[PDB]
Amino acid sequence: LCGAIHSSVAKQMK
Amino acid sequence: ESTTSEQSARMTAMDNASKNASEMIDKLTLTFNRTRQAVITKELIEIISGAAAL
Amino acid sequence: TTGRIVAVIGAVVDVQFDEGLPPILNALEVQGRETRLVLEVAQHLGESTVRTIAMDGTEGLVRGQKVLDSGAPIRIPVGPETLGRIMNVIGEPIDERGPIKTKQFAAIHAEAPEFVEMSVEQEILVTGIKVVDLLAPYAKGGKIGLFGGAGVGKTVLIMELINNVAKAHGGYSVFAGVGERTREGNDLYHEMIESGVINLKDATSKVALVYGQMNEPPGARARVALTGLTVAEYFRDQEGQDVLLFIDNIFRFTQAGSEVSALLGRIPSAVGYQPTLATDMGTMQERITTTKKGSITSVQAIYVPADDLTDPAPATTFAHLDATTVLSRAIAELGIYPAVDPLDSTSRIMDPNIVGSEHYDVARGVQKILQDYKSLQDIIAILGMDELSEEDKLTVSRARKIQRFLSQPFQVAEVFTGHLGKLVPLKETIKGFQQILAGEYDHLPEQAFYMVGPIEEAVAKADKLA
Amino acid sequence: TTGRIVAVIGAVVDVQFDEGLPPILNALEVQGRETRLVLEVAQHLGESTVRTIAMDGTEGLVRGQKVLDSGAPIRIPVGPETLGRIMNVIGEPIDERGPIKTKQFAAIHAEAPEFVEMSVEQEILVTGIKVVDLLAPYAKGGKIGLFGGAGVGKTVLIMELINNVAKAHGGYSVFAGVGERTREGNDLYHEMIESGVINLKDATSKVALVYGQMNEPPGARARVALTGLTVAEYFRDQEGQDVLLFIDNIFRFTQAGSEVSALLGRIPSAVGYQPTLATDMGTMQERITTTKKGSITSVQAIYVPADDLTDPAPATTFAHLDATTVLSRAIAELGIYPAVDPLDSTSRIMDPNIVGSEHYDVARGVQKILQDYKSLQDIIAILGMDELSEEDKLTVSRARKIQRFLSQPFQVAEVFTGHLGKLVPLKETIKGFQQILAGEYDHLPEQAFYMVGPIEEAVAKADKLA
Amino acid sequence: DLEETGRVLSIGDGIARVHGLRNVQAEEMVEFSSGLKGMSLNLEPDNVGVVVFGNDKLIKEGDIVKRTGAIVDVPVGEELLGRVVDALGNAIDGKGPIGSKARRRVGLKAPGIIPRISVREPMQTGIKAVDSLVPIGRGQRELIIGDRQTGKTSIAIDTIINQKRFNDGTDEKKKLYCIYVAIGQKRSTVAQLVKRLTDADAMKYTIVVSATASDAAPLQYLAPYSGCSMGEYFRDNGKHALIIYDDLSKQAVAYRQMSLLLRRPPGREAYPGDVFYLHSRLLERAAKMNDAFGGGSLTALPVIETQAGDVSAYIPTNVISITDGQIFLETELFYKGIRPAINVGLSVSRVGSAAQTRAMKQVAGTMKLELAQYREVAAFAQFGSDLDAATQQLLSRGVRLTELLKQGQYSPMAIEEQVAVIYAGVRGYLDKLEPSKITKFENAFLSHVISQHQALLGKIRTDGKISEESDAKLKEIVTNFLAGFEA
Amino acid sequence: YFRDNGKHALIIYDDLSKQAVAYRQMSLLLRRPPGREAYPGDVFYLHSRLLERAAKMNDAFGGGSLTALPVIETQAGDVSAYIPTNVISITDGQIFLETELFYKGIRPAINVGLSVSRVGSAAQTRAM
Amino acid sequence: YFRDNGKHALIIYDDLSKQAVAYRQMSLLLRRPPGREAYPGDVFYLHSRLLERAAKMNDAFGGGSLTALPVIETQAGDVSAYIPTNVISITDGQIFLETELFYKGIRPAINVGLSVSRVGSAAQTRAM
Ligand SMILES: CC[C@H]1O[C@]2(C)[C@H](OC(C)=O)[C@@]1(C)O[C@@H](/C=C/C=C/C=C/c1oc(=O)cc(OC)c1C)[C@@H]2O
Ligand SMILES: CC[C@H]1O[C@]2(C)[C@H](OC(C)=O)[C@@]1(C)O[C@@H](/C=C/C=C/C=C/c1oc(=O)cc(OC)c1C)[C@@H]2O
Ligand SMILES: Nc1ncnc2c1ncn2[C@@H]1O[C@H](COP(=O)(O)OP(=O)(O)NP(=O)(O)O)[C@@H](O)[C@H]1O
Ligand SMILES: Nc1ncnc2c1ncn2[C@@H]1O[C@H](COP(=O)(O)OP(=O)(O)NP(=O)(O)O)[C@@H](O)[C@H]1O
Ligand SMILES: [Mg+2]
Ligand SMILES: [Mg+2]
């Protein structure tokens, strides 16, 4: 549960 | 950088999480206490009702 | 026959007779009074006494006072001459326009139409309200119910419906105000005058008004429903007329019933209510119905006490409707109007073989997504959306826009919405809802959907925001 | 009048009179009992019979036993010679120091000061306690809710208030223990004695003790607070002082009410309490005020059931309270004494319109600062005490000086605190905190403010501390 | 003997069971040997149950009870103004007997459909929030609802006081006699209440009924009906009254005490089945008559105390379902320093828009709108950073507008004054400014136009609208003041 | 009739909730002291007596049978409720329908976990 | 007997809950009015009378004592139900036992945080 971390990179990674 | 941003994020996040939990502990207690009271009344009324029908 | 007032407690007056004991349901007239005071017989206590329920305040009555058997039950003017007039529980005019001169008189107590008399035709009644039409559609000659805790939207909804449906209706209409506000009766009457449904000049009025408000003693409130009811029955059967019957609020009747019940000397049932709750609702609700002879579409507002839908009153009422609109404080407080609970409102017409499968499928489509949202809700509540799946966040988006599109401005509520009232045609609703479901608008902002008619307007509102 | 006993059911005796029936509230004496049995009158069952509630065990009563109508409610010895004595519900001595010999006797059931006797204005009553007087000012004739129990200086604070009332206002105090644990009474007794408030040797006692032990029947624990009231009323209505009334604890008052109620067979209301909860309270609370002659001020110990502040018992009670004094274990544990909570304790009169702009502002200053420091408290411990600004460092410093200045030595605790007691004056109180806020003593150090009286001592302590 | 008299059979639980009185009517007032009063409730085959209007200690088995042939009623008429009477009409200011000519039953039925008309006359409170966002009409029933100590009564008062501005005026049709009914309160409080009224020279136009914490339940019960009858005189004679029921909560508990003692089946919260009616009947009596009936009116602001902000309770719901809107004061707001602790979203006025003045329409109209767009983004979340200019800007009016609505006690404003200051905020004159200065602007800017431009104000007030000049004139006025305002 | 004559019958009691209220009413109006929840102290009995009648007769008695499907309405899906439990303790199982499941798409809204059959596979074809 | 005669005596009441029930049963059968939980209005007084008979005497009286350990059975840890309410309010402190603790390995199950002794250190040894 780290905020919108893993996702923020995740989206812009594709 | 990705650690400042992370430890920043977790911080705030967990900050609102308890902020949410609190709003809830305060909310549930009220439901509790309303029910608590209601249960007691409900019973008494039942007793009184049956006593009175004799 | 002449009896004598034996006892008096609130609305429960006990009268004794010597020669003729009046049957139960018979209306007695108290003698020695400035105005009419009818007593309706309720039971034979034996010992040649009858226990009755007054229809007006009992102050002034005196033990030993003379009472007269009317010989029959409360009878009231029925016919077209009631059209455009306001009348009492006991059928006297209260519109200061003279006597209601009718050929026939009907008694407020009748039996319910028989089984063989029932009808089973099921036609959809479009109201122009998005949520209603889509998810819990009403039906011609059907039974509709608006459940609502205090100040949630029951009356506004009835008005809007009166507006959207009653206004352009062929047959007659009967409004019955039971236990509600006097000013409301007044608000309506005058409005009715204006739009000409009530005409004080010609015989062109299409509505008959019956009232027994928040200011009457219990017995009156306990019977006015019956009264309005009767009037409606006339048009139905005697003229094979297609009627509309609006009642505000039927909860009041039951409440009224609980008021005198102790006085009748009955052991109370749950929550202090009268043990006859259900049967009383029963023999009354069962006359408000469409038959082979005529059609009665009836919309009834159902007050929910303390907001508790499990309260005996409302609880017992569900079973009498064909379609129910349960209003929610939570929703209203969120600013959603009409404050309709989409997962709690239902309709016996929500069948593919009746609304068509296109309708059926959007309908259940919408509910499914909201149901889904619902499970996610525990979590969104502590942790918000962050931790949500890309897929989950998508239900949420859609749900929040579907949730917003379910609201809508009523003309009747223009003064509060700050927006112009809207009426959306069914196909427009079926549609606008598909698209939403189908991801055709995942780009627009939620706010775009809030408070609008057709989807088309929602797109625009989006441009305006942007 | 001499009546007979017709029935005895637990603590409820029914008595029959031949000629002349004692009105409700009268006290009847039972004839032929080792000890005094007073039966208070409650109802006139009709047929020359009264229904009374016993004030003690009906243990050996006999149908036919003689009862003598004392022709009046329970009356008790009132006046100075009560001070320092311990007394029963019916004004009896339970300290074994022989007879309470006063001139006047006062019936306990009395009406309250007519509207025209009411004082029209709000005045703070000063106790000399820095927290109390500065942040939650008592009110003359008002009622204060004293929260918190053991370990926290409850009895020492009760004892200092007593003393400071005798000192600063020449007013005396009463103590009514409603449902007191016999153990705890005897322990209170000796404790007051050891601290002087009571003097067995002379006539310098500043308190009268009234006891309603837990073993006593409902009726007894029911009335004892009134008895205490009667006594206090004297020192106001006869000698126009400013009396102090202590009811410990207000809850047991209500409870005792319910028990009696139930015994009288009346249907309980919400949550089980008496139907007469609000009146039982009001008829008592209202006798506590500022009349033109003087004033009674009441410190009431409150127990909150189920920790439920909306419980009928507590809720009802707050309807009358003008301020709360919250004693806190947390504060005590830091050594802080009196262990009152500066942020939780409150007062109705903390209105500039009442305490005056100055008073009001200082107070509002003390609190905010105390509030702010609380914020930083979280930062300090975690991220360490230094991102702190020239500003953030002052709020603390001061706040910390403040917090301490809010502590204080009691004269009741001199018997071995070694430290002499202080009765700081209101003027000195506001000046004091005024300056710290101001910043006159910012240079001054913490331990200069710990347990002192007026700011002057904050100065001298620093001298003695380099 | 026994036709007009009765001997008590038994007193207990506040119901005297009398024998005889063969002629009483139901609900007639009767008298006890001890000059105590009662209402004949139950007319039973062999006794009369009577409800004693005071302590029943005084009554005893065998006392004499005498009829009065009068259905419960009370002293009514202009001679009550400035009087502090009890629930029976008896004076309690100890200022000598009320010289009343008329009398009036406490129990009359409210006026029907025909005689009424939509409320169209404003009933100014002088309270910004109220008068701008929750307009009361004359003849409306508007509920004041909130927990203990949230400043409920405080609204009633500023309202009473604000009336002087019209009662000391020109026209009769612009006046309002106030009636304040106090139920279950502390005398200490009522006593002090009139003092405030008196010092404001408002008592001159107010009547005050008291059934306080110490009076028998039946009196508490009865009190509001009495006041209501007194207010009815004015309604009934082309005049305009204002009735304040404080609180209906405590009245409700009084009646419940009466009901459990009579043994009536306790229901939800132990309340008897008819408490709704206890209230509907009462509040139906406030009303706006039409010309044919005098055009008079009665305005009821009944007060209800919720526990823990629970607006769903039986009683609160009951009352909400009767009045024509509510004013919910919130504890949070109160502490947070937002006073009057009004909850602008929750609170409503079902009938008052028409009653409201155009001028306010003009300024207040765009205020909830701005405040609507602020309501949203104004989270619980203390520490929130943001983007987007629009949404940012919206958040900035809101904090100002909210400062504009804070108001102190005993300082009711003239409608014209309110539109003035509201103008300032709703037009932007405060945007360039810091929330802590809003308060300060207000007093300062206000005195300024009060001293200096009574000229414009009078137009606004007199016109009743904001004319192009007035508006043009005003605009520069905010303009200049601003330009000179010291931070 | 059918059961006792070697024939087979199926009876639906729709619903036993409304009958209980009628019983309660009838009963209270006869002045029989109200019991738990206002119902007569014998509501269990009122239903037991009835449902016991549904039965499988041996070949000695015709081998006929009566199968019953009584309906009961809960409130707020609370099955623990007194009446609900009164009837669940008489029948040979229950089919619990949830509105949650329903809305979710699971139609019939049978709640696997909460519904049971005390007959088990003995009432199933081997195929099943 | 002991207390009075300069002797010390300990007494365990196991439980006061059951006795309350015995009393309640007679009260209702004698038809006295029932209050919360059907308990008579003098149930409080039944225990207080009892629990007060315990006390520490004065040398003037023998210095003998009577300590009492009364047992109350709560329900679902409802420490505020009626009888549990009374007795807690009458006594000098409570030893609160808990299942969760018990099953977690804490035996005896004393909830140290909520347990109390008004008497406190006035009864501990200096050693302790
Ligand atoms: C608890 C309320 C629930 O009732 C709903 C039906 C949803 O429950 C589920 C199953 O769906 C729910 C959780 O949330 C509501 C959503 C309410 C949305 C309110 C939106 C308001 C809003 O939305 C906008 O976009 C712009 C707006 O103001 C300009 C406003 C006021 C819906 O009515
Ligand atoms: C819950 C504790 C809080 O309640 C306070 C009011 C403060 O809250 C805020 C709002 O201000 C607080 C955080 O800290 C306490 C402070 C206690 C201080 C104790 C000091 C003790 C002490 O201080 C000294 O300087 C010397 C001492 O002994 C030689 C001793 C015992 C206060 O009462
Ligand atoms: N459809 C709506 N759109 C906007 N606001 C509405 C709507 N319906 C109700 N309201 C608001 O809610 C208030 C109460 O509406 P109303 O229709 O009177 O509720 P109700 O159910 O009749 N109340 P009551 O009958 O007292 O229980 C209205 O005056 C509006 O402020
Ligand atoms: N507009 C205001 N601005 C600031 N302080 C106010 C305001 N109105 C009230 N107060 C304060 O708030 C207190 C409570 O207001 P009050 O009208 O007594 O509330 P209430 O709701 O009537 N409380 P109660 O009647 O005790 O249940 C007053 O005593 C003042 O100290
Ligand atoms: Mg309505
Ligand atoms: Mg108030």
Side-chain angles (χ1 to χ4, degrees), chain C residues 391-410:
Chain C
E391 201 172 297
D392 276 336
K393 297 164 165 194
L394 187 67
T395 87
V396 185
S397 331
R398 269 154 195 180
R400 298 177 56 85
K401 300 171 186 194
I402 264 142
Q403 234 166 42
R404 276 150 190 78
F405 191 58
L406 292 168
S407 63
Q408 149 189 6
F410 279 1

Side-chain angles (χ1 to χ4, degrees), chain C residues 7-9 56 59-63 96 150 181-183 186 214-217 252 255 306-308 311 415, chain E residues 20-21 25-26 42-44 47-48 109-110 113 268 276-277 280 284 312 317 320-324 350 353:
Chain C
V8 169
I9 302 87
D56 212 334
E59 356 79 54
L61 301 179
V62 190
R63 293 157 300 182
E96 273 177 17
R181 302 157 165 92
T182 309
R183 108 174 148 66
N186 176 86
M214 260 184 227
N215 57 151
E216 310 291 349
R252 298 298 177 199
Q255 172 171 65
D307 286 7
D308 186 10
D311 180 75
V415 206
Chain E
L21 284 168
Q25 299 147 293
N42 301 112
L43 306 180
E44 288 171 34
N47 74 83
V48 176
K109 175 137 73 162
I113 284 148
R268 185 172 296 272
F276 150 98
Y277 178 59
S280 50
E284 271 257 298
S312 269
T317 53
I320 279 168
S321 88
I322 303 175
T323 63
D324 298 297
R350 307 196 200 175
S353 332

Side-chain angles (χ1 to χ4, degrees), chain G residues 12 17 20 25-26 29 44 46 63 98 116 121:
Chain G
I12 300 81
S17 294
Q25 168 178 325
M26 298 181 281
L29 293 169
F44 178 90
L46 180 90
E98 291 186 5
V116 223
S121 290

Side-chain angles (χ1 to χ4, degrees), chain C residues 151 153-156 180-181 184 214 248-249 301 303, chain E residues 321 350:
Chain C
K154 310 177 285 273
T155 299
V156 166
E180 290 286 319
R181 302 157 165 92
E184 270 169 351
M214 260 184 227
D248 198 356
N249 197 270
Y303 179 84
Chain E
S321 88
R350 307 196 200 175

Side-chain angles (χ1 to χ4, degrees), chain E residues 75-80 98-103:
Chain E
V76 151
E78 297 220 325
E79 38 270 87
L80 275 65
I98 323 286
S100 213
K101 300 171 176 178
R103 274 194 105 68

